[PDB]
Design an enzyme around this catalytic site. Structure first.
Site, mmCIF file in Angstrom:
data_model
loop_
_atom_site.group_PDB
_atom_site.id
_atom_site.type_symbol
_atom_site.label_atom_id
_atom_site.label_comp_id
_atom_site.label_asym_id
_atom_site.label_seq_id
_atom_site.Cartn_x
_atom_site.Cartn_y
_atom_site.Cartn_z
ATOM 1 N N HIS A 131 4.563 -9.133 -1.252
ATOM 2 C CA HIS A 131 5.852 -9.423 -0.753
ATOM 3 C C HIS A 131 6.545 -10.668 -1.169
ATOM 4 O O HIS A 131 7.649 -10.486 -1.330
ATOM 5 C CB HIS A 131 5.513 -9.240 0.858
ATOM 6 N N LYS A 140 3.895 1.149 -4.770
ATOM 7 C CA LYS A 140 4.894 0.750 -5.869
ATOM 8 C C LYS A 140 4.338 0.879 -6.981
ATOM 9 O O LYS A 140 4.832 1.240 -8.257
ATOM 10 C CB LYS A 140 5.571 -0.583 -5.284
ATOM 11 N N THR A 141 3.043 0.369 -7.271
ATOM 12 C CA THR A 141 2.294 0.358 -8.679
ATOM 13 C C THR A 141 2.042 1.717 -9.023
ATOM 14 O O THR A 141 2.278 1.941 -10.299
ATOM 15 C CB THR A 141 1.060 -0.559 -8.259
ATOM 16 N N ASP A 166 0.761 -1.209 -0.177
ATOM 17 C CA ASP A 166 -0.160 -0.011 -0.007
ATOM 18 C C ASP A 166 0.875 1.218 0.057
ATOM 19 O O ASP A 166 0.173 2.404 -0.021
ATOM 20 C CB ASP A 166 -0.975 0.252 1.015
HETATM 21 N N1 LIG Z 1 -2.763 10.137 -1.228
HETATM 22 C C1 LIG Z 1 -1.849 9.411 -1.889
HETATM 23 N N2 LIG Z 1 -2.352 8.217 -2.076
HETATM 24 C C2 LIG Z 1 -1.515 7.371 -2.941
HETATM 25 C C3 LIG Z 1 -0.466 8.096 -3.630
HETATM 26 N N3 LIG Z 1 0.420 6.756 -4.018
HETATM 27 C C4 LIG Z 1 -0.573 5.901 -4.158
HETATM 28 N N4 LIG Z 1 -1.618 6.137 -3.413
HETATM 29 C C5 LIG Z 1 -2.711 5.364 -2.879
HETATM 30 O O1 LIG Z 1 -2.471 4.185 -2.104
HETATM 31 C C6 LIG Z 1 -2.915 2.999 -2.376
HETATM 32 C C7 LIG Z 1 -2.078 2.006 -2.830
HETATM 33 O O2 LIG Z 1 -1.160 2.066 -4.003
HETATM 34 P P1 LIG Z 1 -0.476 1.227 -4.836
HETATM 35 O O3 LIG Z 1 0.480 1.928 -5.684
HETATM 36 O O4 LIG Z 1 -1.389 0.043 -5.350
HETATM 37 O O5 LIG Z 1 0.405 0.393 -3.549
HETATM 38 P P2 LIG Z 1 1.419 -1.089 -3.742
HETATM 39 O O6 LIG Z 1 0.527 -1.961 -2.838
HETATM 40 O O7 LIG Z 1 2.622 -0.491 -3.009
HETATM 41 O O8 LIG Z 1 1.664 -1.206 -5.242
HETATM 42 C C8 LIG Z 1 -3.943 3.232 -3.632
HETATM 43 O O9 LIG Z 1 -5.254 3.686 -3.427
HETATM 44 C C9 LIG Z 1 -3.295 4.592 -4.288
HETATM 45 O O10 LIG Z 1 -4.116 5.456 -4.914
HETATM 46 C C10 LIG Z 1 0.087 9.059 -3.177
HETATM 47 O O11 LIG Z 1 1.228 9.649 -3.619
HETATM 48 N N5 LIG Z 1 -0.724 10.240 -2.484
HETATM 49 MG MG LIG Z 2 1.229 -2.781 -6.239
#
Ligand SMILES: Nc1nc2c(ncn2[C@@H]2O[C@H](COP(=O)(O)OP(=O)(O)O)[C@@H](O)[C@H]2O)c(=O)[nH]1
Ligand SMILES: [Mg+2]
Ligand SMILES: Nc1nc2c(ncn2[C@@H]2O[C@H](COP(=O)(O)OP(=O)(O)O)[C@@H](O)[C@H]2O)c(=O)[nH]1
Ligand SMILES: [Mg+2]
Lengths: 366, 361
Positions: free
Chosen positions: A58, A16-17, A13
């Protein structure tokens, strides 16, 4: 242009994506067995081409870092400013050290959600402390304060932070050594006698170049010996063999009974044999066709290094009693005879040629 | 003798330590997370009291949320000279949220306040505070005393300690014993013993399970029911015993760690609840940075971790290490729970918080 392999790591969360998509979007606007789950994208700066791997979870980051298709030349650690470092932040830095990821850049994400400059400096100081705990240079590490989401949505002040990140990729991640420029190494496969020529050993040259007249060491399994290359044949069309080529190397004087499969030919003094090393190992899950039950300190499987397998015994870390399918662990291995190895060498663990594990040599003991 | 757990709460310097000493003195002559406590025992003719006092506000917050003993009643100490103060209000609210069932008030330092109208004014303010947080303010026993003059042996003030003890004895009921509550067993191990069937193991939390009785299987998956066909101790299993319960029918893959066996109808599964949470400080080995509304840690309920997401109070943006806050939690799957169930908040199996279920949503 130089090709660089990178990837995102960090806690679920943390973004990364989202960052993977933001980098692709912004750079286009500005400069236009084991189950392996990956997201692959490529993007370009003015001077470099990047191949970027992200993983859904992970367990996948663990498998990519230990046995993925591409060695990362650098990693982008994504840390959400809202949570700060979390368990997989710590685990991915540790795994980065153990598997030899040479550089880490940090993208401090979700800074759109954090108004407090003291809070941002506090998270940055915690990240640098964690990097330094695992022998990364926390004080020199580039840390970019950004918003992957606001950059993906097209906000100029946040797209600028993606440009800042790409500027750090270009400046902070050097290109790796090309295989042709490393010390000669040939993992030996077949061993022939040719009447009135001598012993020929075959393999695919891993690193470097071997030329007629050059001294080579024979390393692993038995005590190290030395000989001279008296000829080189290439399999598929002065004489030489080059990194990536299938070759036959003719040796002066060496008999069939003095060289074997799973030894290496190497530039003399460039690689040493070892029985004992610390490793990071991923144990395949039952769904990957691996073990159904945990193993304990007595376990004695086969270790597959380049062109051969060698039995060995394991020791587990302080306070660890067993290793479950799907676990990754630090294990100390003692092989029944020495193998030529450097830190970073990959190996397989097998039970009668069922793969049950994948490892990387982390540290050589003595 | 019936055993009753009590303790002092209230604002720093209002006289909790002094009262603790005065009760002990007068009754004798008459008859990870860092846990800081003062423990004393004292007796009335009919009851044995185990009394907890704490040095600081943060210690009272930790005792109410994760203390070794559930308070059967609290003595709120209010200095007549200050009246109610910020920790007065915070301890009453926390007492409601963690389910402290009875509060008695000791209005202290009455040796310093000569004016009867002023004493009645402080009493009215305390009653209104108690009622604001759903305690019965109008009927709450309020003893006007001096902990210091009683401790110093002044008979007029020793008599008010006796009045406080008579209120402990008359106002606080004995709690339900665990043996007398509906059967609950938190499930740990799940075995197939061919020729018998599925055994589930754990320590009986409440009540008694007997061969032949129907049990419900509650949490994680939709509730199921079966019969007890056997009880082994490590006819019946009783509160506090390690047991193996043999089940009619149930396969090893139809029951799991983290579910409970319960008396049917006695407990329900929930995903969503309001809680009171204490977040460990950096000095307790907890988090170094605040967390915000996106935080997704694990919630440890009895025998298992469950991921959940949180909502903070309106106008709260973040939670610092050492803070205690009301949070609304939404778990990724249901857990058998009642108001008053304690849980841990963990990161990678490491504890970063302690909470109590305050309200099921
Ligand atoms: N407010 C905010 N939310 C973010 C940001 N980057 C990602 N998100 C939110 O955090 C959540 C997880 O992002 P995601 O890229 O799928 O996380 P991952 O599990 O690391 O790949 C999603 O709802 C995104 O829209 C950011 O820079 N600001
Ligand atoms: Mg992801
Ligand atoms: N005048 C007066 N002082 C008191 C009384 N009770 C406590 N004190 C004083 O108030 C101060 C704080 O008492 P203490 O019991 O340590 O407060 P705590 O922080 O609530 O534990 C001390 O100086 C006590 O001697 C009382 O009934 N009358
Ligand atoms: Mg005190």
């Amino acid at each position: 242009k130089p090709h660089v392999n990178v990837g995102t790591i960090g806690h679920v969360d943390h973004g990364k994506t989202t960052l993977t998509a933001a980098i692709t979007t912004v750079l286009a606007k500005t400069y236009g067995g084991i189950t392996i789950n990956t997201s692959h994208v490529e993007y370009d700066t003015p001077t470099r081409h990047y191949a970027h791997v992200d993983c859904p979870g992970h367990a996948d980051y663990v498998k990519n870092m230990i046995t993925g298709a591409a060695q990362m030349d650098g990693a982008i650690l994504v840390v959400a400013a809202t949570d700060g470092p979390m368990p997989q932040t710590r685990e991915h830095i540790l795994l980065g050290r153990q598997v030899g990821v040479p550089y880490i850049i940090v993208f401090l994400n979700k800074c759109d959600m954090v108004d407090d400059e003291e809070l941002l400096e506090l998270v940055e100081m915690e990240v640098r402390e964690l990097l330094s705990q695992y022998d990364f240079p926390g004080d020199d590490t580039p840390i970019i304060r950004g918003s992957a989401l606001k950059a993906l949505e097209g906000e100029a002040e946040w797209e600028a932070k993606i440009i800042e990140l790409a500027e750090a990729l270009d400046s902070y991640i050097p290109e790796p050594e090309r295989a042709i420029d490393q010390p000669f190494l040939l993992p030996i496969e077949d061993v022939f006698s040719i009447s009135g020529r001598g012993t020929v050993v075959t393999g695919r040259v891993e690193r470097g170049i071997v030329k007629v007249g050059e001294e080579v060491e024979i390393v692993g399994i038995k005590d190290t010996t030395k000989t001279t290359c008296t000829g080189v044949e290439m399999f598929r069309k002065l004489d030489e063999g080059r990194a990536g080529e299938n070759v036959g190397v003719l040796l002066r004087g060496t008999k069939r009974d003095e060289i074997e499969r799973g030894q290496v030919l190497a530039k003399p003094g460039s690689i040493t044999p070892h029985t004992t090393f610390e490793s990071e190992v991923y144990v395949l899950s039952k769904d990957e066709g691996g073990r159904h039950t945990p193993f304990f300190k007595g376990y004695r499987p086969q270790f597959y290094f380049r062109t051969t397998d060698v039995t060995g015994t394991i020791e587990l870390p302080e306070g660890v009693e067993m290793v479950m399918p799907g676990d990754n662990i630090k294990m100390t291995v003692t092989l029944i005879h020495p193998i030529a190895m450097d830190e970073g060498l990959r190996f397989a663990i097998r039970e009668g040629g069922r793969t049950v594990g994948a490892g990387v040599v982390a540290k050589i003991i003595a």
